[PDB]
Amino acid sequence: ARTVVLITGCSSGIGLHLAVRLASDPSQSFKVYATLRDLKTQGRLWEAARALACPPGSLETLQLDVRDSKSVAAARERVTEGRVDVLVCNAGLGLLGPLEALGEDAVASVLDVNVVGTVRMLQAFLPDMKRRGSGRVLVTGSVGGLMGLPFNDVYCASKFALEGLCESLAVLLLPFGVHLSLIECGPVHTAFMEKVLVLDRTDIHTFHRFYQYLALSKQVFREAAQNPEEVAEVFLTALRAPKPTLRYFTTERFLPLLRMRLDDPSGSNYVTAMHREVFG
Amino acid sequence: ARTVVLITGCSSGIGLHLAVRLASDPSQSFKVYATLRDLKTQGRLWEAARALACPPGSLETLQLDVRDSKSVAAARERVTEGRVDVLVCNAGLGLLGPLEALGEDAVASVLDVNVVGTVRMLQAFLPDMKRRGSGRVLVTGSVGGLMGLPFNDVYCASKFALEGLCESLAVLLLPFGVHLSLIECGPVHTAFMEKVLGVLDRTDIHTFHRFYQYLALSKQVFREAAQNPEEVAEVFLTALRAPKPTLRYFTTERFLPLLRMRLDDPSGSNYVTAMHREVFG
Numbered sequence: 101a102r103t104v105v106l107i108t109g110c111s112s113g114i115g116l117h118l119a120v121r122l123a124s125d126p127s128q129s130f131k132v133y134a135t136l137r138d139l140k141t142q143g144r145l146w147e148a149a150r151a152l153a154c155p156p157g158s159l160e161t162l163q164l165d166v167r168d169s170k171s172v173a174a175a176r177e178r179v180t181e182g183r184v185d186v187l188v189c190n191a192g193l194g195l196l197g198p199l200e201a202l203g204e205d206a207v208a209s210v211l212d213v214n215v216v217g218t219v220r221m222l223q224a225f226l227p228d229m230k231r232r233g234s235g236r237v238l239v240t241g242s243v244g245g246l247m248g249l250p251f252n253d254v255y256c257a258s259k260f261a262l263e264g265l266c267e268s269l270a271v272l273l274l275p276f277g278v279h280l281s282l283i284e285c286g287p288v289h290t291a292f293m294e295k296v297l298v299l300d301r302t303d304i305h306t307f308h309r310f311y312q313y314l315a316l317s318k319q320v321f322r323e324a325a326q327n328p329e330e331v332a333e334v335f336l337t338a339l340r341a342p343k344p345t346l347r348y349f350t351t352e353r354f355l356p357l358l359r360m361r362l363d364d365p366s367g368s369n370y371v372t373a374m375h376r377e378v379f380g
Numbered sequence: 381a382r383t384v385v386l387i388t389g390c391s392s393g394i395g396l397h398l399a400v401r402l403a404s405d406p407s408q409s410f411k412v413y414a415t416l417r418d419l420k421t422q423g424r425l426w427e428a429a430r431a432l433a434c435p436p437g438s439l440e441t442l443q444l445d446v447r448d449s450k451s452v453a454a455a456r457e458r459v460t461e462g463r464v465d466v467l468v469c470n471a472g473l474g475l476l477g478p479l480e481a482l483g484e485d486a487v488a489s490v491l492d493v494n495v496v497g498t499v500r501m502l503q504a505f506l507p508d509m510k511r512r513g514s515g516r517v518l519v520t521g522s523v524g525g526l527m528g529l530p531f532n533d534v535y536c537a538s539k540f541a542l543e544g545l546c547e548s549l550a551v552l553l554l555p556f557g558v559h560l561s562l563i564e565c566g567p568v569h570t571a572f573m574e575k576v577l578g579v580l581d582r583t584d585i586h587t588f589h590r591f592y593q594y595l596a597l598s599k600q601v602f603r604e605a606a607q608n609p610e611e612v613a614e615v616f617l618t619a620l621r622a623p624k625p626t627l628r629y630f631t632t633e634r635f636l637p638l639l640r641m642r643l644d645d646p647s648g649s650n651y652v653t654a655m656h657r658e659v660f661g
């Protein structure tokens with residue numbers, strides 16, 4: 101009990117790890133409502149929770165498909181404390197591919213989950229934190245949300261959108277007690293990439309470039325990808341702040357890339373640097 | 381004429397003005413297909429085309445509703461010259477109000493017109509450009525796309541999505557001889573805002589208050605700082621002119637001190653406080 105937390109997308113990767121990290125906190129002060137798109141996939145979560153030995157009642161899972169506003173309401177109605185102190189917007193999908201090759205459904209789907217879904221959670225939940233003048237909104241950051249990456253145009257679009265959405269609300273919410281923070285992450289070892297996935301819809305040059313990008317991402321992800329457990333610690337950090345900043349970074353690694361991006365509004369610099377980073 | 385320009389959102393504001401500025405060019409080098417979401421509202425385009433006297437055959441309008449891919453294909457197939465030298469993705473929409481007060485179809489249209497709508501345009505026009513090894517794609521920027529503005533949360537999300545889409549595509553296109561640039565705009569006197577909004581029920585009194593506090597400020601800013609749809613149109617020309625154009629063209633320096641401010645603060649709270657003070661004193 102105390103500190104009701106409600107996290108989205110906890111079947112795996114980040115959701116699952118922060119769920120049980122929070123529920124197994126030595127302080128025992130968190131009540132965790134791990135929500136998932138489909139409960140039948142909750143095996144691992146529970147096994148992890150069970151393996152960690154969490155106070156009974158410290159974990160509860162609800163079904164919440166962030167792309168359905170009815171699902172959202174319902175789960176909210178299932179939070180018995182009638183309050184959420186920490187709201188975690190963590191679900192999201194990637195989408196890779198030459199822009200001309202991406203399909204309408206995939207595009208829409210990405211935007212609906214990553215952006216539109218955070219919008220739904222907040223509408224359903226800001227109100228009562230604002231009214232209670234207390235609440236903490238933590239949103240899962242992503243680096244392809246801070247800078248453009250070749251072949252991930254739509255993913256990046258949907259990921260920059262969260263920044264924008266988040267940045268607008270913090271400008272407002274400051275005064276109401278509610279604090280929003282993004283936990284920005286680089287590659288992380290989750291279920292993410294395995295799910296993320298042309299010849300007939302792209303031209304020979306983009307095609308070969310695609311394949312060249314592809315190969316490299318995978319080698320690099322494997323080299324940089326952090327642990328999903330490393331990332332929960334950052335969410336804990338932020339949520340431990342007395343006055344939390346709007347950005348928390350899970351690694352210093354992209355920092356350098358970011359600064360030369362910001363050091364040049366025309367953007368010509370980043371473009372060249374990123375083209376060479378990706379195609380040598 | 382020769383440079384074939386294709387512009388979306390030409391029933392008014394920047395679309396309209398860019399469309400007849402180019403068409404009435406002395407050089408007379410451009411052919412302009414000004415597309416309109418609904419051709420029936422093209423009378424003002426024509427009257428203005430007339431007012432600057434675009435020679436016959438310099439301007440052709442078409443229906444293109446960026447929300448519908450069949451509309452896109454059709455427009456594309458009515459480009460007689462079979463090629464587009466400049467693609468101006470301009471149609472866009474605003475949405476203003478407490479997040480919690482915004483309607484699900486409102487939030488969705490804003491993302492589909494603004495974000496998916498440019499994704500549909502490029503998917504259709506880019507390929508041939510890439511084949512040609514030549515083309516210039518200009519996208520109407522927006523400052524709500526570079527930094528966050530209270531009570532404009534979804535408008536800003538859709539606008540930061542055009543930056544990620546265009547920057548992501550720019551890293552790739554670099555070596556293809558295809559040029560994509562964002563014309564970043566601060567406030568402008570177009571129809572944009574008359575439609576942005578006109579709450580009590582859908583939000584608390586505390587938020588309701590801030591809302592009005594914000595409308596006070598924005599109205600003042602538009603009033604004392606907006607630019608003309610034609611001031612803006614000279615930037616797309618500057619941008620289309622440069623032989624080696626950048627990703628961004630700002631139509632004003634105005635929010636550049638505030639842009640840097642943000643730029644030199646990764647953690648993001650300096651900008652949040654400044655913006656906070658700067659709007660709700």
Ligand SMILES: NC(=O)c1ccc[n+]([C@@H]2O[C@H](COP(=O)([O-])OP(=O)(O)OC[C@H]3O[C@@H](n4cnc5c(N)ncnc54)[C@H](OP(=O)(O)O)[C@@H]3O)[C@@H](O)[C@H]2O)c1
Pocket residue numbers: 108109110111112113114115136137138141164165166167190191192193194213240241242243285286287288289290291292293295328
């Ligand atoms: N992995 C990385 O390297 C990385 C880097 C930066 C940012 N991120 C971001 O971190 C979050 C992804 O976490 P992850 O890396 O752990 O990915 P993941 O392992 O694939 O886990 C994501 C979770 O999101 C869920 N989800 C998908 N659609 C949903 C929906 N409609 N409603 C509710 N839940 C849904 C998934 O459930 P199902 O499995 O049932 O579909 C899964 O539980 C997103 O914000 C992602 O963009 C990840």
Ligand SMILES: NC(=O)c1ccc[n+]([C@@H]2O[C@H](COP(=O)([O-])OP(=O)(O)OC[C@H]3O[C@@H](n4cnc5c(N)ncnc54)[C@H](OP(=O)(O)O)[C@@H]3O)[C@@H](O)[C@H]2O)c1
Pocket residue numbers: 388389390391392393394395416417418421444445446447470471472473474493520521522523565566567568569570571572573
């Ligand atoms: N006004 C500003 O202060 C400002 C500032 C920065 C950026 N911008 C941007 O520049 C663009 C132009 O807007 P504006 O300022 O010129 O105001 P505007 O006069 O309202 O321009 C909007 C035009 O685009 C059209 N459009 C809307 N939805 C469409 C759709 N689904 N399919 C095709 N066309 C559609 C509108 O059609 P209908 O007439 O039929 O509605 C209208 O012709 C937008 O991207 C806007 O975000 C404007």
Ligand SMILES: C[C@]12CC[C@@H]3c4ccc(O)cc4CC[C@H]3[C@@H]1CC[C@@H]2O
Pocket residue numbers: 242243244245249252285286287288317320321377378
């Ligand atoms: C797209 C991400 C950003 C930065 C990463 C990167 C950054 C630079 C680069 O040359 C390749 C990659 C591939 C994998 C990427 C990441 C996987 C998820 C993350 O958001």
Ligand SMILES: C[C@]12CC[C@@H]3c4ccc(O)cc4CC[C@H]3[C@@H]1CC[C@@H]2O
Pocket residue numbers: 474521522523524525529565566567597598601658659
């Ligand atoms: C972001 C825009 C330019 C900046 C404008 C601004 C900038 C500062 C501010 O305090 C209020 C407003 C009102 C609306 C904004 C605009 C709406 C559309 C445009 O993109």
